[PDB]
Design an enzyme around this catalytic site. Structure first.
Site, mmCIF file in Angstrom:
data_model
loop_
_atom_site.group_PDB
_atom_site.id
_atom_site.type_symbol
_atom_site.label_atom_id
_atom_site.label_comp_id
_atom_site.label_asym_id
_atom_site.label_seq_id
_atom_site.Cartn_x
_atom_site.Cartn_y
_atom_site.Cartn_z
ATOM 1 N N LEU A 145 74.419 66.176 23.583
ATOM 2 C CA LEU A 145 74.195 66.202 24.544
ATOM 3 C C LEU A 145 73.410 65.803 25.403
ATOM 4 O O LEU A 145 73.577 66.192 26.478
ATOM 5 C CB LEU A 145 72.285 66.293 22.856
ATOM 6 C CG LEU A 145 71.885 67.945 23.121
ATOM 7 C CD1 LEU A 145 71.665 66.859 21.779
ATOM 8 C CD2 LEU A 145 70.674 68.378 23.985
ATOM 9 N N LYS A 157 75.043 61.582 27.765
ATOM 10 C CA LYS A 157 75.881 60.201 27.368
ATOM 11 C C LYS A 157 75.014 58.780 27.684
ATOM 12 O O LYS A 157 73.745 59.052 28.384
ATOM 13 C CB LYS A 157 76.667 60.157 28.757
ATOM 14 C CG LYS A 157 77.710 58.150 28.799
ATOM 15 C CD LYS A 157 78.392 58.445 29.876
ATOM 16 C CE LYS A 157 80.133 57.697 29.684
ATOM 17 N NZ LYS A 157 80.667 57.675 30.487
ATOM 18 N N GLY A 158 75.135 58.530 26.163
ATOM 19 C CA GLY A 158 73.988 57.328 26.370
ATOM 20 C C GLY A 158 74.426 55.715 26.500
ATOM 21 O O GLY A 158 75.270 55.970 27.793
ATOM 22 N N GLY A 159 73.519 54.722 27.100
ATOM 23 C CA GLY A 159 74.399 53.869 26.944
ATOM 24 C C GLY A 159 75.611 53.100 26.689
ATOM 25 O O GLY A 159 76.737 52.027 26.978
ATOM 26 N N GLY A 176 77.438 55.611 24.091
ATOM 27 C CA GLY A 176 77.463 55.924 22.814
ATOM 28 C C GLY A 176 76.531 57.310 22.662
ATOM 29 O O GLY A 176 75.638 57.434 23.757
ATOM 30 N N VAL A 229 74.531 61.459 22.533
ATOM 31 C CA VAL A 229 73.550 61.240 21.936
ATOM 32 C C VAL A 229 73.683 63.091 21.432
ATOM 33 O O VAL A 229 73.815 63.870 22.322
ATOM 34 C CB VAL A 229 72.303 61.061 21.988
ATOM 35 C CG1 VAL A 229 71.086 61.520 21.891
ATOM 36 C CG2 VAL A 229 71.706 59.673 22.579
ATOM 37 N N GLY A 241 63.566 70.337 24.559
ATOM 38 C CA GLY A 241 63.162 70.831 25.750
ATOM 39 C C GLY A 241 64.398 70.018 27.634
ATOM 40 O O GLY A 241 63.877 70.423 28.581
ATOM 41 N N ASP A 255 61.459 51.590 32.537
ATOM 42 C CA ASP A 255 62.072 51.787 32.364
ATOM 43 C C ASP A 255 61.831 53.576 32.523
ATOM 44 O O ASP A 255 63.076 54.644 32.385
ATOM 45 C CB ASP A 255 63.434 52.043 31.605
ATOM 46 C CG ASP A 255 65.054 51.963 32.283
ATOM 47 O OD1 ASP A 255 65.078 52.033 33.407
ATOM 48 O OD2 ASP A 255 65.550 52.788 31.440
ATOM 49 N N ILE A 260 62.225 61.173 30.439
ATOM 50 C CA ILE A 260 61.379 61.931 29.847
ATOM 51 C C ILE A 260 62.060 63.352 29.479
ATOM 52 O O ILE A 260 62.823 63.971 29.950
ATOM 53 C CB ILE A 260 60.337 62.140 31.348
ATOM 54 C CG1 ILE A 260 60.077 60.731 31.479
ATOM 55 C CG2 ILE A 260 58.839 62.747 30.730
ATOM 56 C CD1 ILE A 260 59.409 59.295 30.731
HETATM 57 N N1 LIG Z 1 66.095 62.836 21.506
HETATM 58 C C1 LIG Z 1 66.060 63.434 22.246
HETATM 59 N N2 LIG Z 1 66.324 64.808 22.955
HETATM 60 C C2 LIG Z 1 67.394 65.271 23.477
HETATM 61 N N3 LIG Z 1 67.919 65.067 24.389
HETATM 62 C C3 LIG Z 1 68.238 63.258 24.178
HETATM 63 C C4 LIG Z 1 67.287 62.774 23.298
HETATM 64 N N4 LIG Z 1 67.768 61.914 23.104
HETATM 65 C C5 LIG Z 1 68.366 61.513 24.384
HETATM 66 N N5 LIG Z 1 68.160 62.934 24.871
HETATM 67 C C6 LIG Z 1 69.988 63.493 26.386
HETATM 68 O O1 LIG Z 1 71.240 61.681 25.524
HETATM 69 C C7 LIG Z 1 70.994 61.403 27.020
HETATM 70 C C8 LIG Z 1 71.017 59.973 26.733
HETATM 71 O O2 LIG Z 1 69.889 59.709 26.196
HETATM 72 P P1 LIG Z 1 69.372 57.886 26.720
HETATM 73 O O3 LIG Z 1 70.085 56.926 26.949
HETATM 74 O O4 LIG Z 1 68.755 57.425 25.390
HETATM 75 O O5 LIG Z 1 68.063 58.051 27.586
HETATM 76 C C9 LIG Z 1 69.522 61.333 27.986
HETATM 77 O O6 LIG Z 1 69.331 61.349 29.450
HETATM 78 C C10 LIG Z 1 68.948 62.674 28.006
HETATM 79 O O7 LIG Z 1 69.623 63.363 28.548
#
Ligand SMILES: Nc1ncnc2c1ncn2[C@@H]1O[C@H](COP(=O)(O)O)[C@@H](O)[C@H]1O
Length: 553
Positions: free
Chosen positions: A191, A193-195, A197, A199, A267, A310, A316
């Site tokens: 869904l 790219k995390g910091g 790995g 998601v 969403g 942050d 959000i």
């Molecule tokens: N609980 C979640 N539901 C849907 N998308 C998510 C969720 N957590 C993270 N993402 C997506 O994955 C990206 C990377 O995760 P993060 O590094 O935790 O922000 C985010 O910018 C979101 O687009």
């Protein structure tokens, strides 16, 4: 090509209904969730504290079972109903409140019928009846509420603890305490790219509830030495129980990664909704609503002596119905009462002056970022970030005041401005009113804050369920998986510290929603149809009348 459309339609089916009767549930769940032997619980019995507020109030299944136990004894059954009444009354709007309140008065406080609690002073009975009619205030019943709980939390408590119901609870508890591994969930398309790995979405095989799985790659962690930064996000997320922060439900490890299983927000992020959604930005009413929510979110984290550090569009996200939750709390940190903290951390453009300056602070930066974001919602562009270089933006913040395009209303300006006040000790929120003052800004005219916190206000935009609000797979990056790094014993100790397994409250709620609880907990209904013949093949006295009819004409 094939690949994209695939996982996409896949996900939609799961989000839809899943596999027919079994609402996402694996065709062998009843087994996955078979209770343990009573003896297998005795250990766990000793561990659990005999704490009323823990077992009967905070832990949904705990509460449920306690209620269920109460249902047996009329004196309790009525206490409970009473509490459920007040709880309603205390959220019932003013025009209806008096009408609702009087019913409870006449129901539970009637001097004619059986008495409520064993020793109720007649003063407080009549005392309350009077205060009621002249000005029905919220805390009208708090006197009795407190007394009621005091009643339960003693003998009816001990009684439950020593009841079968409690055994059943121990079983339920045992289940949540069971190891979680790769096997507990299904996987899906990523869904974002995390910091540390990708998601991707994921489903709990046994219950069929949907979740997000934030993966953090064990290797990519040692390289950046961001070991605390992970544990931190977890431990925080674990503790938090706000409507406006994503709840965490599981924490487990794989060969390659540590995982956080998070409230699946369907969403997507606001960074998507602002930029890749036709013309940039949102109409006032909308941007307001979000800020207003994100406001409460911040209130909640702050009320817990925690600073986010942050707030931004990446972090959000939106739920099915269209509300938001703050997410990714890697940078967050706890602020001890009566203290201050220095820490130069965040995302460029959203970091407040005093942060960049490397000055001590408490909650300031967050309220700043809310400004920044509220700006970035109406304006359609970052108030400080066409690609611009590093240091200039920092300077642009330190000194240069904000510039307004013609989209902002009179009041829309005043708030943003007050929030983007470069003087921390004079910035809105930080002045000594916390959220209270930010709420009280006249921009939030036609929004009832009490209600919004309950989520009882309809968001001005409901997402389309059939839509996937993020990029396609091959439209997302992946950094070089650098080798030349081997995991050593010292790391395992940390992995132990990290993978707690299932988080009690959220786990339990999952169980309830997915109906597994009600489906599985209830005992004495199946197979209880009293047998036609006895053990030695003989009819009882007298023989089942329906049985004869099945052996003749
Ligand atoms: N609980 C979640 N539901 C849907 N998308 C998510 C969720 N957590 C993270 N993402 C997506 O994955 C990206 C990377 O995760 P993060 O590094 O935790 O922000 C985010 O910018 C979101 O687009």
């Amino acid at each position: 090509e094939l690949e994209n459309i695939v996982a996409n339609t896949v996900l939609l089916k799961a989000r839809e209904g899943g596999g027919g009767n079994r609402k996402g549930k694996s065709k062998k769940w009843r087994q996955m969730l078979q209770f343990p032997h009573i003896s297998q619980c005795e250990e766990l019995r000793l561990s659990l504290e005999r704490d009323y507020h823990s077992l009967c109030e905070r832990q949904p299944i705990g509460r449920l079972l306690f209620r269920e136990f109460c249902a047996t004894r009329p004196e309790l059954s009525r206490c409970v109903a009473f509490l459920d009444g007040v709880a309603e009354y205390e959220v019932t709007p003013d025009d209806k409140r008096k009408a609702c309140g009087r019913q409870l008065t006449q129901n539970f406080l009637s001097h004619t019928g059986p008495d409520l609690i064993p020793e109720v002073p007649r003063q407080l009975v009549t005392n309350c009846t009077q205060r009621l009619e002249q000005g029905p205030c919220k805390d009208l019943f708090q006197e009795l509420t407190r007394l009621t709980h005091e009643y339960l939390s003693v003998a009816p408590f001990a009684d439950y603890l020593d009841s079968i119901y409690f055994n059943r609870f121990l079983q339920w508890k045992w289940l949540e305490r069971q190891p979680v591994t790769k096997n507990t969930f299904r996987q899906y398309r990523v869904l974002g790219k995390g910091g540390f790995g990708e998601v991707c979405a994921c489903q709990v095989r046994a219950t069929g509830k949907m979740y997000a799985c934030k993966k953090l790659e064990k290797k990519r962690i040692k390289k950046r030495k961001g070991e605390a930064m992970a544990l931190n996000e977890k431990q925080i997320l674990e503790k938090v129980n706000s409507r406006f922060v994503v709840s965490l439900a599981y924490a487990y490890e794989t060969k390659d990664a540590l995982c956080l299983v998070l409230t699946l927000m369907n969403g997507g992020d606001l960074k998507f909704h602002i930029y890749h959604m036709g013309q940039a930005g949102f109409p006032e009413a909308r941007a307001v609503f979000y800020a207003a929510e994100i406001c409460c979110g911040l209130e909640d984290l702050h009320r817990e002596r925690i600073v986010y550090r942050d707030l931004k569009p990446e972090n959000i996200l939106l739920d099915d119905h269209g509300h938001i939750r703050i997410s990714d709390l890697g940078l967050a940190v706890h602020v001890p009462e009566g203290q201050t903290i220095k820490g130069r951390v965040g995302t460029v453009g959203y970091m407040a002056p005093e942060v960049v300056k490397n000055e001590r602070y408490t909650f300031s930066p967050d309220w700043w970022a809310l400004g920044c974001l509220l700006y970035e919602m109406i304006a359609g562009q970052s108030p400080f970030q066409k690609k611009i270089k590093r240091e200039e933006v920092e300077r642009l913040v330190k000194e240069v005041p904000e510039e307004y395009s013609e989209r902002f209303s009179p009041q829309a300006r005043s708030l943003c401005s007050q929030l983007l006040c470069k003087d921390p000790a004079e910035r809105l929120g930080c002045r000594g009113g916390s959220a209270r003052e930010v709420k009280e800004h006249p921009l939030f005219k036609k929004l009832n804050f009490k209600r919004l916190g309950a989520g009882m206000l309809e968001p001005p935009f409901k997402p389309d369920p059939q839509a996937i609000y993020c990029k396609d797979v091959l439209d997302i990056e992946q950094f070089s998986t650098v080798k030349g790094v081997e995991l050593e014993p010292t790391d395992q100790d940390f992995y132990q510290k990290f993978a707690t397994g299932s988080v009690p409250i959220p786990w339990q709620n999952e169980m309830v929603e997915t109906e597994c609880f009600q489906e599985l907990n209830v005992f004495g209904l199946d197979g209880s149809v009293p047998p036609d013949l006895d053990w030695k093949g003989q009819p009882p006295a007298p023989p089942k009348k329906g049985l004869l009819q099945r052996l003749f004409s």
